[PDB]
Amino acid sequence: IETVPVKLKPGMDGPKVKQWPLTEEKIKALVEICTEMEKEGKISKIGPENPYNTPVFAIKKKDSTKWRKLVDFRELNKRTQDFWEVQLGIPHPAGLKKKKSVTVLDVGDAYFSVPLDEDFRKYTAFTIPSINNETPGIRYQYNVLPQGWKGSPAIFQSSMTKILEPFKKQNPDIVIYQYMDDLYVGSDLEIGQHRTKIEELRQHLLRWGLEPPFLWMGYELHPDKWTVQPIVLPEKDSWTVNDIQKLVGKLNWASQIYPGIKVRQLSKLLRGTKALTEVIPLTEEAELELAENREILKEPVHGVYYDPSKDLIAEIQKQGQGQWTYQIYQEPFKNLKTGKYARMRGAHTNDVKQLTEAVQKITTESIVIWGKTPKFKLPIQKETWETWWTEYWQATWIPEWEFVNTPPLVKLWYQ
Amino acid sequence: MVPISPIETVPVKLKPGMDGPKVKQWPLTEEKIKALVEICTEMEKEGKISKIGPENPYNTPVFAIKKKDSTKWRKLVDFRELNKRTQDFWEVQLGIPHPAGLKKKKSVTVLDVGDAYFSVPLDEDFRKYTAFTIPSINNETPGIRYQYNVLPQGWKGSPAIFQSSMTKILEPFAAQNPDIVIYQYMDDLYVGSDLEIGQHRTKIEELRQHLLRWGLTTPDKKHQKEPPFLWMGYELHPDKWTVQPIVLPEKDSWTVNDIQKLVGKLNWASQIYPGIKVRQLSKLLRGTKALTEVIPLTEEAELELAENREILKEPVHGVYYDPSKDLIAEIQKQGQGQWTYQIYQEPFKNLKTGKYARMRGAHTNDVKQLTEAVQKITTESIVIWGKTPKFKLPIQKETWETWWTEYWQATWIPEWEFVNTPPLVKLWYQLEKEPIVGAETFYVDGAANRETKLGKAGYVTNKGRQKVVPLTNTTNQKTELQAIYLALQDSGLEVNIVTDSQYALGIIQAQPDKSESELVNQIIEQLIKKEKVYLAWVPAHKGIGGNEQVDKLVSA
Ligand SMILES: Cc1cc(/C=C/C#N)cc(C)c1Nc1ccnc(Nc2ccc(C#N)cc2)n1
Ligand SMILES: O=C(O)c1cc2cc(F)ccc2[nH]1
Ligand SMILES: O=C(O)c1cc2cc(F)ccc2[nH]1
Ligand SMILES: [Mg+2]
């Protein structure tokens, strides 16, 4: 009820980001939402003395037909202070990734009950644009804790733990972690039991609340089934020249990751100038060298550690037929997690929708294991991505990304 | 009197850590001083300014300019220094409405709101920073000190605060009269509607009444400006629009300036005049920016200019947007990385046109350019109409499916249909996914001495075919491309090619059909003539036979 004092970072002005173009359907949805938010006092109109701006758009959360307003606070979040006043941080629960059912809850609407510091409200300015700029854009600022701002969970954390006090010590086994507007609850129980303690969780937030529009949702994960990618070599009875060349190519690549990888006996099999499709029998020295490389590739990578002070980097490769591979790392050749997707949802004809959904799932994984989002290297032209990714976004957070314009030859080795 | 609602002031601050201006007042002639005294006395009568005491330490210079061909002077307060110290504001005039997004209107009336501007008060705490001084006659008395009570002309915050003040005034009238459109530009309000002229003129009088609640008067003698409107370089008519007249000048010799303004006019005309091209004319300004130098115009530039003069012979108009009908966008390839498009709803009546130029880069192809042109039209269409148009593209559906399924990047074009108007966009070659049985296998390699720039390129094959070519003024990367070219030159219509060049693969795997390197273009020309080509990569210096043999030949 009393505002917490909040400041930007030293020598840093507020955000002045351009509101990207919005379709007619999203503008009308935002006007209807912001009109209601203005009536409820969450936002207020502002004048021209506020020069700051943060982009806004509208999405549809997974499995619903109602528009949700999403503010892209990425630039603001960079510019606001880092909050270690009460707690140096929330030590990320390493047990969340080890429960076998984790449900994601949208509790962002609970932030609207806490007022925002009056001096900081001007930095949350956003604009509802008009089609063809025919009418002046509608300018608002936040009076309460905004969804998507990194200061909202920090300021509201004091209130959140007290709401969850009756539920957590009744169910001590259960892992609860908050990231932005999301609440992840992990359990080792059976799913039929799981969903009703999910709604048992929902009991507490509406009970205190007196209505949240998206609190009734549930995003079911299974971090226990989450698959790893180790390096595997083909098992063949007949090897062509091309087969051995591809094998030596992959093994030369793995030698950057694993020390003792040798390709000398296998390369000797190529001695001569032979047709690519000609079958080459494996020598013994080559078979032993191949088996020794297999044994090496069954062990983990040496010297692989996570550092919370460094950024997580996520690379993605398009493998075709709706399949995608990805790797999360902080140092080159030191993969913290690797994976592969294929079950991409309702986009067998849309590459960009598949990639957008891959980014969201990878970010969700990164939040569960380390508690922060990675910076993506996207295999897509910048203009293509920025035109369409908002049409398939269903998460309340937005990560950072850069674009890959040169085809990686490492794609050959991850399929 | 009738009480009027006051216009709430906008709180204005100086930039953090800055103080108000303290600029010297220039000496003025005795004739100029009198003129400013009479002018400022009238402004004070109207409440625009007020005389202040000597404690105010701020000052802004004042000048007197002779209104040309008249005995009347005019004032000018040079707020350039105060503007540097005034905070930034939100500027709503950021983006012009494009005429192609407007709606047809039976009636569009104009109302003057020039008197309403100085009914907008300036923030009381900021007025001290607007202080200025009229010098006294012979400098024998203290100069007359004034400060502003209203938004001063030339001040940084005056446009934004005026627009926002009028916006807040018009909001309830527009919301409760949804059958009209209101738009503000400078000191005028433009009201359009589809209402009968009786009901329309009634709405105008209702707007005049509504404006008097704030005490803002509008001239009864209705505005002289009438359709068509000359506005932001356009001509606006009730049911059509166009650009203001584009006249390409006759010139026996052209300057960098003349070409800069020529391309600017052509760019402006390209939004309604279909097929405007500017590549050959823009090539003449590459890198150089000496304003006055003359450049001989190539024969390619005279053809492009003559084509543009033929496009601009007679006027062309665009229609206004009908929200009840779909948007259609059609694109054509013009050559040399040039693309032109039209956006329409009914056949043969464009809402607008446009063009797209290939980005400068090493390598590209037609499919990539068509994709980029689609994304530019899509974004422009979201701005102007709030929706993506249906596309008609000169590319076969089968060609597109082959491209995006095998392209290493994710790519997507919105809903589109094939239009059979040449030149059609096509794929010129497609590499094999597996090695070819029966095809000769060429192991290529190249190397070059980094100092002497001498190198070799060549190949060895499984049938014993060999070649090594000595090269001069080349690099390691050039010899690797030259070696691939030699294999394509000397092979049949199906060939397997083995190389160790990650550089050459990064190029070919990007699938270009035209490059800034002629060496890559020769390789592309060879690829187009082949039936089957399989390109295989191996790492270098690993004893890989075939690659090891030719490496020793070319690095010798
Ligand atoms: C942007 C704009 C510029 C001017 C013009 C400013 C000036 N000078 C006048 C108006 C009224 C508007 N606003 C809108 C809004 C929606 N449809 C239209 N259509 C429309 C506008 C003018 C004419 C005409 N003649 C016909 C249709 N105008
Ligand atoms: O719909 C319009 O024409 C319109 C809406 C509106 C709102 C304002 F605040 C000012 C002018 C406007 N014109
Ligand atoms: O659709 C095309 O233009 C196209 C498909 C295709 C397949 C090939 F194998 C070779 C050239 C091609 N061009
Ligand atoms: Mg070599």
PDB file of C-alpha atoms in Angstrom, chain A residues 16-18 21-25 45 47-53 122 127 130-137 139 241-242 245-246 248-249 252 263-264 267-268 270-277 318 320-321 324 348-352 354-355 378-381 383-384 387-388 392 404-409 412-413, chain B residues 10-11 87-90 92 94-99 101-103 160-161 164 167 171 182-183 371-372 375 378-379 382-388 404-412 414 434-438 441 443 460-462 496 498 502 505-506 509-510 534 536-539 542-546 548-549:
ATOM      1  CA  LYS A  16      12.591   5.987 -25.585  1.00  0.00           C
ATOM      2  CA  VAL A  17      11.669   2.982 -27.747  1.00  0.00           C
ATOM      3  CA  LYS A  18       9.491   3.204 -30.865  1.00  0.00           C
ATOM      4  CA  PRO A  21       3.236  -1.239 -36.113  1.00  0.00           C
ATOM      5  CA  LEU A  22       0.139  -3.037 -34.832  1.00  0.00           C
ATOM      6  CA  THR A  23      -2.748  -4.630 -36.696  1.00  0.00           C
ATOM      7  CA  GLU A  24      -6.309  -3.341 -36.444  1.00  0.00           C
ATOM      8  CA  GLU A  25      -7.405  -6.261 -34.256  1.00  0.00           C
ATOM      9  CA  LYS A  45      -3.338   9.299 -19.331  1.00  0.00           C
ATOM     10  CA  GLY A  47       0.837  14.619 -21.291  1.00  0.00           C
ATOM     11  CA  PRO A  48       3.581  15.641 -23.720  1.00  0.00           C
ATOM     12  CA  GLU A  49       6.032  16.454 -20.906  1.00  0.00           C
ATOM     13  CA  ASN A  50       6.587  12.682 -20.649  1.00  0.00           C
ATOM     14  CA  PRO A  51       9.002  11.874 -23.522  1.00  0.00           C
ATOM     15  CA  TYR A  52       9.543   8.213 -22.614  1.00  0.00           C
ATOM     16  CA  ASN A  53       7.945   5.262 -24.373  1.00  0.00           C
ATOM     17  CA  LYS A 122       6.723   8.268 -15.941  1.00  0.00           C
ATOM     18  CA  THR A 127       1.468   4.409 -26.614  1.00  0.00           C
ATOM     19  CA  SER A 130      -3.806   4.505 -34.455  1.00  0.00           C
ATOM     20  CA  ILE A 131      -4.113   3.063 -37.949  1.00  0.00           C
ATOM     21  CA  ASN A 132      -2.308   5.281 -40.480  1.00  0.00           C
ATOM     22  CA  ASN A 133      -1.520   7.687 -37.591  1.00  0.00           C
ATOM     23  CA  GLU A 134      -4.821   9.395 -38.385  1.00  0.00           C
ATOM     24  CA  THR A 135      -5.674  10.109 -34.718  1.00  0.00           C
ATOM     25  CA  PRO A 136      -3.170  10.990 -31.908  1.00  0.00           C
ATOM     26  CA  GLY A 137      -1.755   7.903 -30.147  1.00  0.00           C
ATOM     27  CA  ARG A 139      -0.556   7.793 -24.081  1.00  0.00           C
ATOM     28  CA  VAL A 241      34.006 -43.015 -49.146  1.00  0.00           C
ATOM     29  CA  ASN A 242      31.371 -40.347 -48.493  1.00  0.00           C
ATOM     30  CA  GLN A 245      34.400 -38.418 -45.002  1.00  0.00           C
ATOM     31  CA  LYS A 246      31.277 -37.387 -43.084  1.00  0.00           C
ATOM     32  CA  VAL A 248      35.914 -37.913 -40.120  1.00  0.00           C
ATOM     33  CA  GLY A 249      34.279 -34.498 -40.428  1.00  0.00           C
ATOM     34  CA  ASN A 252      37.186 -33.635 -36.209  1.00  0.00           C
ATOM     35  CA  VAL A 263      40.883 -39.717 -36.863  1.00  0.00           C
ATOM     36  CA  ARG A 264      44.258 -40.860 -38.181  1.00  0.00           C
ATOM     37  CA  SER A 267      41.588 -40.979 -42.628  1.00  0.00           C
ATOM     38  CA  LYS A 268      44.104 -43.552 -43.881  1.00  0.00           C
ATOM     39  CA  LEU A 270      40.683 -42.651 -47.731  1.00  0.00           C
ATOM     40  CA  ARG A 271      44.213 -43.071 -49.138  1.00  0.00           C
ATOM     41  CA  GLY A 272      43.934 -42.753 -52.895  1.00  0.00           C
ATOM     42  CA  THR A 273      41.444 -40.843 -55.038  1.00  0.00           C
ATOM     43  CA  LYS A 274      38.290 -42.953 -54.932  1.00  0.00           C
ATOM     44  CA  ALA A 275      34.709 -42.473 -56.060  1.00  0.00           C
ATOM     45  CA  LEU A 276      32.420 -41.064 -53.379  1.00  0.00           C
ATOM     46  CA  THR A 277      30.003 -44.015 -53.585  1.00  0.00           C
ATOM     47  CA  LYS A 318      16.746 -25.754 -38.678  1.00  0.00           C
ATOM     48  CA  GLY A 320      14.058 -29.736 -41.883  1.00  0.00           C
ATOM     49  CA  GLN A 321      10.787 -31.670 -41.740  1.00  0.00           C
ATOM     50  CA  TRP A 324      15.019 -28.193 -34.779  1.00  0.00           C
ATOM     51  CA  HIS A 348       3.883 -27.722 -40.626  1.00  0.00           C
ATOM     52  CA  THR A 349       3.862 -24.969 -43.290  1.00  0.00           C
ATOM     53  CA  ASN A 350       5.277 -22.002 -41.307  1.00  0.00           C
ATOM     54  CA  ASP A 351       8.998 -21.941 -40.500  1.00  0.00           C
ATOM     55  CA  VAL A 352       8.757 -18.738 -38.457  1.00  0.00           C
ATOM     56  CA  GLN A 354       7.994 -23.144 -35.523  1.00  0.00           C
ATOM     57  CA  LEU A 355      11.067 -21.081 -34.632  1.00  0.00           C
ATOM     58  CA  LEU A 378      18.388 -17.037 -34.520  1.00  0.00           C
ATOM     59  CA  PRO A 379      18.780 -18.634 -37.988  1.00  0.00           C
ATOM     60  CA  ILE A 380      16.548 -16.074 -39.692  1.00  0.00           C
ATOM     61  CA  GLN A 381      16.823 -12.709 -41.409  1.00  0.00           C
ATOM     62  CA  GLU A 383      13.435  -8.277 -41.108  1.00  0.00           C
ATOM     63  CA  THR A 384      11.600 -11.602 -41.408  1.00  0.00           C
ATOM     64  CA  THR A 387       7.736  -8.798 -38.869  1.00  0.00           C
ATOM     65  CA  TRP A 388       6.125 -11.994 -37.585  1.00  0.00           C
ATOM     66  CA  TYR A 392       2.961 -16.424 -32.526  1.00  0.00           C
ATOM     67  CA  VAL A 404      22.738 -15.563 -37.860  1.00  0.00           C
ATOM     68  CA  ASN A 405      23.378 -14.690 -41.512  1.00  0.00           C
ATOM     69  CA  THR A 406      26.015 -17.340 -42.302  1.00  0.00           C
ATOM     70  CA  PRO A 407      24.946 -21.000 -42.546  1.00  0.00           C
ATOM     71  CA  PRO A 408      26.674 -22.984 -39.793  1.00  0.00           C
ATOM     72  CA  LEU A 409      28.416 -26.154 -40.861  1.00  0.00           C
ATOM     73  CA  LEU A 412      25.548 -31.355 -40.241  1.00  0.00           C
ATOM     74  CA  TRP A 413      26.720 -32.701 -36.863  1.00  0.00           C
TER      75      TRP A 413
ATOM     76  CA  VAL B  10       1.587  21.329 -19.064  1.00  0.00           C
ATOM     77  CA  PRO B  11       4.344  21.265 -16.392  1.00  0.00           C
ATOM     78  CA  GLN B  87      13.403  19.127 -21.820  1.00  0.00           C
ATOM     79  CA  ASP B  88      12.419  16.698 -24.550  1.00  0.00           C
ATOM     80  CA  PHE B  89       8.713  16.309 -25.290  1.00  0.00           C
ATOM     81  CA  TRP B  90       6.502  13.645 -26.816  1.00  0.00           C
ATOM     82  CA  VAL B  92       2.790  13.079 -31.903  1.00  0.00           C
ATOM     83  CA  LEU B  94       5.997  11.570 -35.661  1.00  0.00           C
ATOM     84  CA  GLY B  95       4.233   9.835 -38.537  1.00  0.00           C
ATOM     85  CA  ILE B  96       2.233  11.438 -41.330  1.00  0.00           C
ATOM     86  CA  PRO B  97      -1.003   9.748 -42.438  1.00  0.00           C
ATOM     87  CA  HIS B  98      -0.438   8.293 -45.850  1.00  0.00           C
ATOM     88  CA  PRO B  99      -3.154   9.378 -48.319  1.00  0.00           C
ATOM     89  CA  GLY B 101      -4.894   4.937 -45.952  1.00  0.00           C
ATOM     90  CA  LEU B 102      -7.475   7.714 -45.814  1.00  0.00           C
ATOM     91  CA  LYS B 103     -11.171   7.136 -46.483  1.00  0.00           C
ATOM     92  CA  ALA B 160       3.685  19.431 -28.758  1.00  0.00           C
ATOM     93  CA  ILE B 161       1.802  21.311 -25.978  1.00  0.00           C
ATOM     94  CA  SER B 164      -1.986  17.888 -26.909  1.00  0.00           C
ATOM     95  CA  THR B 167      -6.404  16.881 -28.736  1.00  0.00           C
ATOM     96  CA  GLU B 171     -11.555  13.992 -27.750  1.00  0.00           C
ATOM     97  CA  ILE B 182     -11.078  15.376 -37.281  1.00  0.00           C
ATOM     98  CA  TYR B 183      -7.421  16.159 -38.072  1.00  0.00           C
ATOM     99  CA  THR B 371      10.968 -12.311 -49.639  1.00  0.00           C
ATOM    100  CA  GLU B 372      12.464  -9.018 -48.443  1.00  0.00           C
ATOM    101  CA  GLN B 375       8.272  -8.104 -45.660  1.00  0.00           C
ATOM    102  CA  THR B 378       3.753  -6.183 -45.156  1.00  0.00           C
ATOM    103  CA  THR B 379       5.184  -3.725 -42.622  1.00  0.00           C
ATOM    104  CA  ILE B 382       0.344  -2.674 -41.233  1.00  0.00           C
ATOM    105  CA  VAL B 383       1.235   1.006 -40.792  1.00  0.00           C
ATOM    106  CA  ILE B 384      -1.154   2.379 -43.400  1.00  0.00           C
ATOM    107  CA  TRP B 385      -4.103  -0.031 -43.214  1.00  0.00           C
ATOM    108  CA  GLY B 386      -3.547  -2.154 -40.100  1.00  0.00           C
ATOM    109  CA  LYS B 387      -3.611  -5.451 -41.996  1.00  0.00           C
ATOM    110  CA  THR B 388      -1.514  -7.618 -44.288  1.00  0.00           C
ATOM    111  CA  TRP B 404      11.834 -22.730 -47.976  1.00  0.00           C
ATOM    112  CA  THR B 405      11.877 -26.449 -47.136  1.00  0.00           C
ATOM    113  CA  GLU B 406      15.572 -26.743 -48.074  1.00  0.00           C
ATOM    114  CA  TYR B 407      16.794 -23.266 -47.088  1.00  0.00           C
ATOM    115  CA  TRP B 408      18.982 -23.331 -43.982  1.00  0.00           C
ATOM    116  CA  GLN B 409      17.147 -20.324 -42.502  1.00  0.00           C
ATOM    117  CA  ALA B 410      13.568 -20.084 -41.325  1.00  0.00           C
ATOM    118  CA  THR B 411      11.538 -18.030 -43.792  1.00  0.00           C
ATOM    119  CA  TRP B 412       7.891 -17.273 -44.435  1.00  0.00           C
ATOM    120  CA  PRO B 414       2.020 -14.553 -45.806  1.00  0.00           C
ATOM    121  CA  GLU B 434      23.451 -37.560 -51.623  1.00  0.00           C
ATOM    122  CA  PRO B 435      26.539 -38.493 -53.658  1.00  0.00           C
ATOM    123  CA  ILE B 436      25.820 -39.395 -57.277  1.00  0.00           C
ATOM    124  CA  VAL B 437      26.487 -42.959 -58.411  1.00  0.00           C
ATOM    125  CA  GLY B 438      28.365 -43.119 -61.705  1.00  0.00           C
ATOM    126  CA  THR B 441      34.413 -37.408 -58.237  1.00  0.00           C
ATOM    127  CA  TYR B 443      38.822 -33.564 -55.334  1.00  0.00           C
ATOM    128  CA  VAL B 460      42.303 -34.803 -59.079  1.00  0.00           C
ATOM    129  CA  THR B 461      39.545 -37.294 -59.896  1.00  0.00           C
ATOM    130  CA  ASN B 462      38.878 -40.998 -59.435  1.00  0.00           C
ATOM    131  CA  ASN B 496      30.713 -35.029 -57.262  1.00  0.00           C
ATOM    132  CA  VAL B 498      35.010 -32.657 -52.674  1.00  0.00           C
ATOM    133  CA  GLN B 502      34.527 -23.778 -45.373  1.00  0.00           C
ATOM    134  CA  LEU B 505      30.680 -23.759 -48.764  1.00  0.00           C
ATOM    135  CA  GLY B 506      29.420 -20.814 -46.721  1.00  0.00           C
ATOM    136  CA  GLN B 509      25.202 -23.091 -49.134  1.00  0.00           C
ATOM    137  CA  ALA B 510      23.703 -19.581 -49.104  1.00  0.00           C
ATOM    138  CA  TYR B 534      26.908 -32.981 -55.137  1.00  0.00           C
ATOM    139  CA  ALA B 536      30.963 -32.548 -50.160  1.00  0.00           C
ATOM    140  CA  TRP B 537      33.114 -30.981 -47.442  1.00  0.00           C
ATOM    141  CA  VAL B 538      36.072 -32.511 -45.604  1.00  0.00           C
ATOM    142  CA  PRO B 539      38.462 -30.953 -43.057  1.00  0.00           C
ATOM    143  CA  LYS B 542      44.003 -34.660 -42.078  1.00  0.00           C
ATOM    144  CA  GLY B 543      45.452 -37.186 -44.524  1.00  0.00           C
ATOM    145  CA  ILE B 544      42.142 -37.474 -46.385  1.00  0.00           C
ATOM    146  CA  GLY B 545      43.075 -39.157 -49.651  1.00  0.00           C
ATOM    147  CA  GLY B 546      42.192 -37.251 -52.778  1.00  0.00           C
ATOM    148  CA  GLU B 548      45.686 -34.790 -49.533  1.00  0.00           C
ATOM    149  CA  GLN B 549      46.999 -35.472 -53.045  1.00  0.00           C
TER     150      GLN B 549
END
